[PDB]
Amino acid sequence: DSSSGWTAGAAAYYVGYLQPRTFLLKYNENGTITDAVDCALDPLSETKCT
Amino acid sequence: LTESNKKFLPFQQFGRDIDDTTDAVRDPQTLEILDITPCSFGGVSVITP
Numbered sequence: 001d002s003s004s005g006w007t008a009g010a011a012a013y014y015v016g017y018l019q020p021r022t023f024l025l026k027y028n029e030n031g032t033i034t035d036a037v038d039c040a041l042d043p044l045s046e047t048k049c050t
Numbered sequence: 051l052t053e054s055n056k057k058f059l060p061f062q063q064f065g066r067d068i069d070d071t072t073d074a075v076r077d078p079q080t081l082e083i084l085d086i087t088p089c090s091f092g093g094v095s096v097i098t099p
């Protein structure tokens with residue numbers, strides 16, 4: 001009936017949640033964002049952003 | 051205002067530089083780049099014997 005038989009088919013979707021962090025961003029000659037670093041993961045990144 | 055050679059992305063428009071002022075704009079009608087840089091500064095000098 002309207003509630004039992006149906007075909008789903010293969011798909012899979014990923015869901016995440018965000019968090020207020022600080023980022024360091026690398027823009028290029030086109031101004032397009034080309035790279036980033038999360039300087040709250042490791043000391044070496046902290047050095048980078050400072 | 052001066053005509054530009056800059057190439058914005060289709061949604062981009064500010065003139066934010068190292069100091070983040072304005073040296074770029076897009077005509078809301080012709081959608082072309084107009085660099086902004088004022089006509090002034092300041093320095094003074096009188097020479098006398």
Ligand SMILES: *[C@@H]1O[C@H](CO)[C@@H](O)[C@H](O)[C@H]1NC(C)=O
Binds near residue numbers: 029030056057
């Ligand atoms: C954008 O990048 C390309 C790389 O193929 C380069 O040829 C072009 O000069 C760049 N545009 C700007 C805005 O300088």
